[PDB]
C-alpha cells in the first residue's frame, strides 16, 4: 500500500544540511557504486540478496544455523588465491560488519586497546583524542 | 500546567484528537467508500 | 620632501583583525545560524519571560559541537559511525526561527 | 579523620622541583603524566640491564 | 644473482615443455613468461616442504642440493620468477638511463602529439605515476596493441617486482623508484658543494626535507634522462611483432584448440 | 553568547557553504576537530586576497572554488592511481568482487548448507577458480556456441602469453643466461 | 633583538588592565606576582 | 518498604551529580578545565556542595562568576566563535573530582 | 506449485568467480585525466546545496507531470545603464 | 537612555573605510 | 627555555667561545626553524607522530645508527602520517581512531591509499614500541607458552627455534618491503609476513613482536646483504614483555 | 648496557622480583607447592580467611 497524504519535502533547519558526497537520490535501477562503502555494500547487499537484514553477525549466524566464519573463509580464500587464510575469514568480518552493526568481542577489545597503547599520546592541545579514547575504554568495563 | 498564570482548560483541542478541526486523511477512499454505499 | 627616502622601505602594519576572523576556532558550525531570542525582564510582577511565546529558556536544540560524540562515544570508537548520517547533519540543527 | 588524614597524606606526598619540562609539578597551565602515561612508559620500559 | 640463476634453471628446465633444449640461452623475459602466475591444480603443494614448513628460507633455496634434486614446483617457481624479474629490471634501467643522447626523434615527437600533445604531458603523467605509489618498485611506460586505436601507449604502476609481461604488455621504458634509490638521493641531497662563492670585495668576510619532494625530484629527474632513441626501437620491434602474420596464425590455433576443448568438455 | 562574525562574513561563509557542501562539511563532518586546518577558512583568506588584487565578489567565489575542485582533483588523482596500482597485486578488493561475495554469503544463506556441503561448495568453487575453462560450449539438444566464461587464473595466463599458449613471444632485447 | 618580552594584540588592554587589578584582591607580594605573572601569560606573552 | 529504603541509600548522593551536571553543561564557556585555577575551583565548590556547607545555586554562581583570565571575553573571541565550549573537558574534570574525592 | 514454477522457468542459481586483477583495464581508463576531470564536473555538479532529504512521491509526481507538460507543448546591459534607468528599478 | 551598562554599547556616532587607512587595512566598519 | 629551544637543537650547560659567524649563522638557523614551526603548525593532521618512549639523542644501542633511525623516524613515517591525513581529512574516515579507519579502510581498492597509509602507520608505531634500547629477557611465562609449539624437547630451545623461523619468514619475503609479525591469531602463536600495506588488526589477528623488512630499515647499516646480521641486532635489542603482556590480556 | 640514568633500589627490586627471576626459597616440598600454585591457583590471597 501507499501513504495516507502526499506532502513535499520537509524544509531544512538551520545548520541541517544533507552530507557531502551522498547521493540522495539513488534508485535500485542504478549502477553498483565502485567504492566499498557502508551505503554501497547495504545497496548492494539489498539488489543482490533480498530484503534480508540482521542487526548483529550473531544473528546472522543464528539464521544461517551453525556455520561460523572459518567456514566461509575457506570458500572466499578459494576465490581469491592471494588472500590467505587470515586474510579470508578478516575479509567476511569486515563485509559482515560493513553490511550491519561491528561485533563486540574480546579480541577487538584487545586489538583496539593494542593500537591505542601504540598511538600513546597526540599533538591536540588538550589531549582531545587521548579522553575520547579512555572515556571509549572506560565505557566497557 | 499554568500558562501566565491561568490554567491549560483542555490540550486535546490543541492536538486535534476529538474535535472538529480533524485532519483528514485517505479522502478519495472515503469518498469512494461513501459513493458506494450511497 | 625628506619622506622620499622612506618610502622607499614602505613597511607597513599587516592585517589582524582578518588573521583573527580566519584562524580556526574551537567553536565552529559547518552552516552559520542566528542564534535564538534570549528571555528578557519583562517586569516587576512578570518576571523574566521571552518575548515570543513567554518562554523561561532560550529555544535550541544544540548548544555545543561535541554533545552528539560524548552521547555516542561507544559507537565512535565500534566504528558504527563511520558513515552515519544522523550525526553527521543534525549535530548542530537548531529551531526553525518562528516569529513575525 | 578521612579529611585531615587525606589531607595531610596529600601535603607530604605532593612533589616539588623542575620536572622534563621545566616545570613546578603543580604549574597552572601545564600538566606532568597525562592519563598515566608516564606509567605506561615505565611498564613498556621496565629496569633490566 | 646470475650465477643462481643459472643454476636454477636446470630444475626449471623440464617443467617447461616447449622450451625444452638445455642451455638454451633462456632469455630473462621469456622465462618470466613461462614462470608467472600458475594455477595449484596442474601443479599441487609438494607434502613437507621446507620453504613451506620454514625449515629453508625462499632465498637460500639454492645453497642445498637436496632441494635442487627435488625442488618444489610452486616455490621454485616464484623464486624464479622474481630473479628474473628483478635482473629484468636492472638491465631495463641500465639500458634506459643512458642521458648520452637527448635527440628527440621526429616520428616519436608525432606519436606523443597525437598521444597529448607535447612531451611536457608525457613527462609529467611519468613524474606524477612514479611520485605517487605504494611500493617502491618500477614505473611502466608500456604499449598494448588492445587499446592502439587511441590509447597505444600508457603507464602503469607496477609492484616491487611484477613485470607487465605478467600481464601481457609490450615495455617501452621504466623508472626507478626504489627505496635504495630514495635513501641515496637523500645522501645525496645532504651532501653538498663548499667553496664555490668567491668573496666579493665589498663583502664583510672581505673586509673582515620531506619524502615526497625528493621522490618527485627523482621520478622529474628519471624522466628527463632517457635514450628515446631505444624506446623507439623498442616500439617500432613492437608495432612490427604486432602486425607479423605469425602471431595471427597462433591465435587463430589456439582459439581452435579452445574451441575443440570446448566441444569435447560439452560432450 | 555573541557571535564574532560580522554580518558580512556570515553571508560570505553560508554562500560558500550553499555553493558547495564539501568546503563546509570537510573541517567538522562529525565533529569539529578544533586543532586543523579549515577548508572554508583558507577559502574566506583567498578570497579576501582576490578581492583586494582586484577580482569582485562572483568571479572571486567562482575562481576560490574551482582553485579547491583543482585541489580535490588532484587527490582523487592520486587515490585512482594508488588504486589500480593495489589492484593489480590482487589482494584488494572493488564492488565487482564484493557483489560477489555477497552472492556467496546470500547462497549461503537462502539456502541452508551443512559443513559437508560449504566445504564441497568451496573445493569445487576453488577448482573453477584454478583450471576455470574458456569458450564454454552449450549444446542445442548438435550445435554449439563458444561464450559465456568466467575469470581464471589460467585465463590470466594464457591472456598474458597473448592468445598463443607459446611464453616466447616478447624478442625485444632480453637478458639470456647462457 | 629581545628588547622586551611582551606583544600584545587585544584592543583596549588598559581597561582590561584596570578591570583584573579591581577584580585581584591581596597585597602580599607573593600574590601580586602571581596576578602579575598570569595577566603577563595570557595578554602578553605570545604563547599562542 | 525495603525498595523505598534501597532507593533511598542509592539516591542520597544524586544531588552532586545534578549540581556537577549543571557545571558541565548550563556553563556555556567555563573556560579550560584542565587548568588547575578552574579545576581547584570546581574541586572546592564540589566538596562543599557535598558536605553541604554551601547550596547548590550559590556554588553554581560561585563556578560562574569565579575569576578565570584577564579579557576573558577578548581572549575567548580568539578561540570560540559562538562562546560555547567542547565539553569533553568538562566531564573529564567533573569525573576526576569525584574520582579524587571519597 | 513449486514444481509447477520449476517446469516453467529454472530452479537454478550460480556464482561467478570474478578476479581483480581482471578490472586493470577499467582502473587505467579511471586513472586517465579525462575520466578525472568528468568525475569532478559531476562531482561539483551535484556538491551544490539539495534540499531533497530522500525519495519524495511529491517531487517525483511532479516533476514528471512537467516533464509530460513539455512533451505535449550582443552587449549586455551595464549597472550604469541600469542605475539611469529608474523605471527598469521599479 | 542616559544609563549605561558595564557590558552593553554606547549610542553610535552619526556619522551621515575611508578615514581609517592609517590603521588596520583589514579593520573594518 | 624548552618551549622555546627547537626540537632539532640542543641545551649545552657547558660554555665554549663562539666566532661571531657562527654565532650569526646559528642564530638564522633559529629563526628558519622557528618560520618552518609556524609553517608546520597550521597544516598538522589529525593523526600525528608518536612519541618515543626511549631516547634516541644517540642511535638505538645494538640496532641502528643515529642517522638512519632518524632517516627511518622522521621520512617515511612523515610522509607515510602525511599522506593519511590528507586522504581521511576529506573522506567521511575523518574523526575516527586509527583502529576503525583501518577496519573499515582495510580490503577496499578504491580506499586502498589511505589504508596503506594507515597500516604503515600501525605498523611503525608498534615497531617502535616493540623496541627496547638495550633489549630484554624473554619472560619465563612467554618462553614456557612458546615452547608447547615451537620447542621442540629441548631447553630454550623455544626462544631459538622463534629466532630462526623469524629470520626464514624474513627472507622468505624476498621483495624487501613489508613487516614480519610474531602474533596469536587466537589459537596459537604464528608469524605472518604482513607485505606493504596490511595491517595485522586489519587482518583480525592479535600482534606480539613487529619486525621491519624494508629495504631502507637496513640499506644504511646493513647493506643490502646485512639481513640476516640485522635479524639478529634486532631479536638481541628486542622487547619480549610487551608480547608477554598482550598475550597474558588476549588469554584473560 | 642501562638506557636509566638511575633507578632507585626499591623500585629496582620490585621489577627485578615482578620479572619472577628472583629464587624462591622452597622449603616446601616442589611437587606440592607446585600442585598447589596450578590446581588451586594463585588467587589464594584474594580470600583473605
Ligand atoms: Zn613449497
Redesign the pocket.
Same mark, same amino acid.
Given at each position: 500500500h501507499g501513504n495516507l497524504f502526499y506532502f513535499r519535502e520537509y524544509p531544512m533547519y538551520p545548520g541541517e544540511y544533507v552530507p557531502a558526497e551522498h547521493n540522495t537520490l539513488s534508485s535500485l535501477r542504478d549502477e553498483l557504486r565502485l567504492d566499498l562503502t557502508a551505503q554501497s555494500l547495504k545497496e548492494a547487499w539489498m539488489r543482490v540478496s533480498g530484503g534480508v537484514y540482521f542487526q548483529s553477525v550473531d544473528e546472522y549466524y543464528a539464521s544461517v544455523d551453525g556455520l561460523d566464519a572459518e567456514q566461509i573463509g575457506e570458500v572466499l580464500a578459494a576465490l581469491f588465491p592471494e588472500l590467505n587464510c587470515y586474510e579470508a575469514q578478516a575479509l567476511v568480518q569486515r563485509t559482515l560488519e560493513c553490511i550491519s552493526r561491528p561485533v563486540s568481542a574480546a579480541s577487538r577489545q584487545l586489538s583496539r586497546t593494542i593500537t591505542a597503547e601504540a598511538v600513546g599520546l597526540d599533538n591536540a592541545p588538550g589531549h582531545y583524542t587521548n579522553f575520547l579514547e579512555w572515556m571509549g575504554r572506560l565505557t566497557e568495563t | 500546567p499554568s500558562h501566565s498564570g491561568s490554567p491549560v482548560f483542555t490540550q486535546a483541542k490543541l492536538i486535534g484528537l476529538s474535535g472538529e478541526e480533524q485532519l483528514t486523511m485517505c479522502q478519495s477512499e472515503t469518498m469512494a467508500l461513501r459513493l458506494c454505499m450511497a | 620632501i625628506y619622506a622620499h627616502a622612506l618610502s622607499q622601505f614602505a613597511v607597513c602594519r599587516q592585517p589582524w583583525n582578518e588573521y583573527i576572523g580566519l584562524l580556526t576556532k574551537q567553536d565552529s558550525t559547518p552552516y552559520h545560524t542566528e542564534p535564538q531570542e534570549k528571555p528578557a525582564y519583562r517586569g516587576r510582577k512578570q518576571g523574566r519571560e521571552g518575548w515570543l511565546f513567554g518562554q523561561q529558556v532560550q529555544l535550541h536544540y544544540h548548544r555545543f559541537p561535541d554533545e552528539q560524540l560524548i552521547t555516542n562515544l561507544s559507537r565512535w570508537r565500534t566504528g558504527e559511525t563511520v558513515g552515519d548520517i544522523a550525526m553527521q547533519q543534525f549535530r548542530n540543527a537548531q529551531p526553525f526561527d518562528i516569529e513575525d | 579523620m578521612g579529611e585531615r588524614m587525606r589531607a595531610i597524606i596529600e601535603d607530604y606526598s605532593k612533589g616539588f622541583g623542575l620536572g622534563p619540562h621545566g616545570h613546578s609539578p603543580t604549574h597552572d597551565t601545564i600538566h606532568y603524566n597525562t592519563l598515566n602515561a608516564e606509567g605506561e612508559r615505565v611498564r613498556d620500559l621496565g629496569y633490566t640491564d | 644473482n646470475a650465477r643462481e640463476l643459472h643454476r636454477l634453471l636446470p630444475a626449471l628446465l623440464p617443467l617447461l615443455d616447449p622450451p625444452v633444449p638445455t642451455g638454451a640461452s633462456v632469455c630473462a623475459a621469456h622465462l618470466i613468461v613461462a614462470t608467472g602466475h600458475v594455477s595449484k591444480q596442474r601443479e599441487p603443494?609438494?607434502s613437507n *616442504?621446507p620453504?613451506?614448513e620454514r625449515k629453508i628460507p625462499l632465498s637460500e633455496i639454492a645453497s642445498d642440493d637436496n632441494f635442487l634434486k627435488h625442488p618444489?614446483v610452486? *616455490?621454485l617457481k616464484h623464486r624464479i620468477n622474481f630473479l628474473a624479474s628483478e635482473d629484468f629490471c636492472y638491465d631495463f634501467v641500465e639500458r634506459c638511463g643512458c642521458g648520452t643522447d637527448g635527440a628527440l626523434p621526429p616520428e616519436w615527437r608525432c606519436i606523443v602529439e597525437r598521444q597529448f600533445g607535447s612531451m611536457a604531458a608525457l613527462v609529467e603523467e611519468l613524474v606524477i605515476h612514479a611520485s605517487n605509489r605504494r611500493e617502491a618498485g618500477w614505473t611502466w611506460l608500456v604499449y598494448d596493441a588492445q587499446q592502439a586505436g587511441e590509447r597505444p601507449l600508457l603507464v602503469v604502476n607496477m609492484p616491487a617486482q611484477r613485470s607487465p609481461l605478467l600481464l601481457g604488455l609490450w615495455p617501452l621504458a621504466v623508472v626507478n623508484v626504489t627505496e635504495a634509490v630514495l635513501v641515496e638521493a637523500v645522501r645525496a641531497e645532504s651532501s653538498g658543494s663548499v667553496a664555490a662563492a668567491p668573496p666579493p670585495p665589498w663583502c664583510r668576510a672581505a673586509r673582515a626535507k620531506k619524502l615526497s619532494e625528493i621522490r618527485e625530484k627523482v621520478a622529474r629527474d628519471a624522466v628527463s634522462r632517457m635514450n628515446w632513441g631505444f624506446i623507439l626501437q623498442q616500439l617500432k620491434k613492437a608495432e612490427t611483432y604486432y602486425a607479423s602474420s605469425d602471431r595471427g596464425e597462433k591465435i587463430r590455433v589456439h582459439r581452435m584448440k579452445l574451441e575443440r576443448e570446448a566441444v569435447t568438455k560439452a560432450m | 553568547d555573541t557571535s564574532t562574525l560580522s554580518p558580512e562574513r556570515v553571508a560570505l561563509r553560508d554562500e560558500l557553504a550553499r555553493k558547495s557542501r564539501l568546503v563546509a562539511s570537510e573541517g567538522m563532518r562529525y565533529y569539529n576537530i578544533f586543532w586543523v586546518r579549515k577548508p572554508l577558512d583558507t577559502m574566506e583568506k583567498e578570497y579576501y586576497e582576490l578581492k583586494r588584487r582586484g577580482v569582485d565578489h562572483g568571479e572571486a567565489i567562482r575562481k576560490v572554488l574551482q582553485g579547491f575542485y583543482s585541489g580535490l582533483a588532484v587527490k582523487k588523482r592520486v587515490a585512482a592511481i594508488q588504486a589500480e596500482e593495489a589492484k593489480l597485486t590482487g589482494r584488494f578488493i572493488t564492488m565487482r568482487e564484493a557483489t560477489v561475495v555477497l552472492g556467496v554469503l546470500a547462497k549461503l544463506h537462502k539456502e541452508q548448507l551443512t559443513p559437508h556441503q560449504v566445504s564441497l561448495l568451496a573445493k569445487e568453487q576453488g577448482e573453477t577458480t584454478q583450471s576455470g575453462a574458456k569458450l564454454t560450449a552449450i549444446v542445442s539438444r548438435q550445435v554449439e556456441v563458444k561464450e559465456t566464461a568466467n575469470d581464471s587464473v589460467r585465463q590470466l595466463r594464457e591472456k598474458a602469453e597473448d592468445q598463443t599458449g607459446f611464453p616466447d613471444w616478447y624478442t625485444g632485447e632480453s637478458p639470456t643466461y647462457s | 633583538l629581545g628588547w622586551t618580552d611582551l606583544f600584545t594584540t587585544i584592543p583596549d588592554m588598559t581597561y582590561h588592565i584596570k578591570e583584573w587589578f579591581d577584580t585581584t584582591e591581596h597585597m602580599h607580594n607573593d600574590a601580586v606576582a602571581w596576578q602579575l605573572g598570569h595577566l603577563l601569560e595570557t595578554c602578553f606573552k605570545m604563547k599562542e | 518498604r525495603r525498595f523505598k529504603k534501597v532507593y533511598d541509600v542509592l539516591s542520597e548522593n544524586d544531588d552532586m551529580f545534578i549540581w556537577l551536571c549543571h557545571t558541565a553543561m548550563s556553563v556555556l564557556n567555563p573556560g579550560d578545565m584542565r587548568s588547575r585555577l578552574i579545576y581547584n575551583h570546581l574541586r572546592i565548590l564540589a566538596e562543599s556542595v557535598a558536605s553541604g556547607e554551601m547550596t547548590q545555586r550559590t556554588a553554581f554562581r560561585f563556578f560562574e562568576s569565579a575569576v578565570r583570565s584577564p579579557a576573558y571575553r577578548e581572549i575567548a573571541k580568539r578561540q570560540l566563535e559562538g562562546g560555547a565550549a567542547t565539553r569533553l573537558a568538562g566531564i573529564s574534570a567533573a569525573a576526576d573530582v569525584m574520582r579524587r574525592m571519597g | 506449485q513449486q514444481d509447477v514454477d520449476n517446469a516453467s522457468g529454472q530452479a537454478h542459481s550460480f556464482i561467478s568467480p570474478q578476479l581483480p586483477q581482471m578490472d586493470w583495464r577499467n582502473m587505467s581508463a579511471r586513472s586517465s585525466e579525462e575520466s578525472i576531470r568528468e568525475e569532478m564536473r559531476q562531482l561539483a555538479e551535484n556538491d551544490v546545496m539539495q534540499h531533497q532529504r530522500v525519495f519524495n512521491e511529491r517531487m517525483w509526481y511532479e516533476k514528471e507531470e512537467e516533464h509530460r507538460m513539455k512533451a505535449r507543448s550582443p552587449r549586455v546591459l551595464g549597472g550604469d545603464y541600469f542605475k539611469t534607468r529608474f523605471g527598469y528599478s521599479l | 537612555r542616559v544609563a549605561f551598562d558595564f557590558n552593553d554599547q554606547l549610542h553610535p556616532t552619526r556619522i551621515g573605510y575611508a578615514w581609517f587607512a592609517s590603521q588596520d587595512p583589514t579593520f573594518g566598519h | 627555555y624548552h618551549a622555546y629551544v627547537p626540537k632539532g637543537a640542543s641545551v649545552q650547560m657547558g660554555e665554549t667561545f663562539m666566532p661571531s659567524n657562527i654565532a650569526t649563522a646559528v642564530f638564522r638557523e633559529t629563526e628558519a626553524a622557528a618560520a618552518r614551526a609556524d609553517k608546520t603548525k597550521e597544516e598538522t593532521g589529525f593523526f600525528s607522530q608518536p612519541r618515543l618512549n626511549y631516547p634516541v639523542s644517540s642511535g638505538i644501542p645494538a640496532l641502528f645508527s643515529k642517522d638512519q633511525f632518524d632517516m627511518q623516524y622522521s621520512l617515511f613515517h612523515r610522509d607515510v602520517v602525511e599522506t593519511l591525513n590528507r586522504h581521511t581529512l576529506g573522506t567521511p574516515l575523518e574523526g575516527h581512531n586509527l583502529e576503525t579507519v583501518i577496519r573499515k579502510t582495510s580490503f577496499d581498492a578504491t580506499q586502498a591509499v589511505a589504508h596503506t597509509a594507515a597500516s604503515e602507520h600501525f605498523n611503525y608505531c608498534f615497531f617502535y614500541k616493540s623496541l627496547r634500547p638495550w633489549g630484554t629477557a624473554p619472560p619465563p611465562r612467554l618462553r614456557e607458552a612458546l615452547q608447547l609449539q615451537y620447542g621442540t624437547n629441548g631447553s630454550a630451545d623455544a626462544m631459538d627455534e622463534v629466532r630462526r623461523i623469524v629470520w626464514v619468514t624474513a627472507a622468505s619475503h624476498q621483495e624487501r618491503c613489508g613487516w614480519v609479525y610474531l602474533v596469536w591469531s587466537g589459537v596459537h602463536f604464528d608469524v605472518v609476513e604482513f607485505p606493504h600495506g596490511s595491517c595485522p588488526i586489519a587482518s583480525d589477528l592479535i600482534p606480539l613482536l613487529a619486525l621491519n623488512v624494508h629495504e631502507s630499515a637496513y640499506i644504511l647499516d646493513y647493506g643490502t646483504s646485512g639481513l640476516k646480521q640485522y635479524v639478529e641486532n634486532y631479536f638481541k635489542a628486542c622487547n619480549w614483555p610487551l608480547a608477554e603482556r598482550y598475550y597474558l590480556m588476549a588469554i584473560g | 648496557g642501562t638506557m636509566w640514568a638511575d633507578v632507585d633500589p626499591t623500585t629496582f627490586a620490585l621489577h627485578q622480583a615482578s620479572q619472577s627471576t628472583r629464587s624462591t626459597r622452597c622449603d616446601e616440598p616442589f611437587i606440592l607447592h607446585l600442585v598447589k600454585r596450578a590446581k588451586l591457583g594463585e588467587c589464594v590471597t584474594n580470600f583473605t580467611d
Open positions: - | - | - | - | 603443494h609438494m *616442504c620453504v613451506l618444489c610452486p *616455490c | - | - | - | - | - | - | -
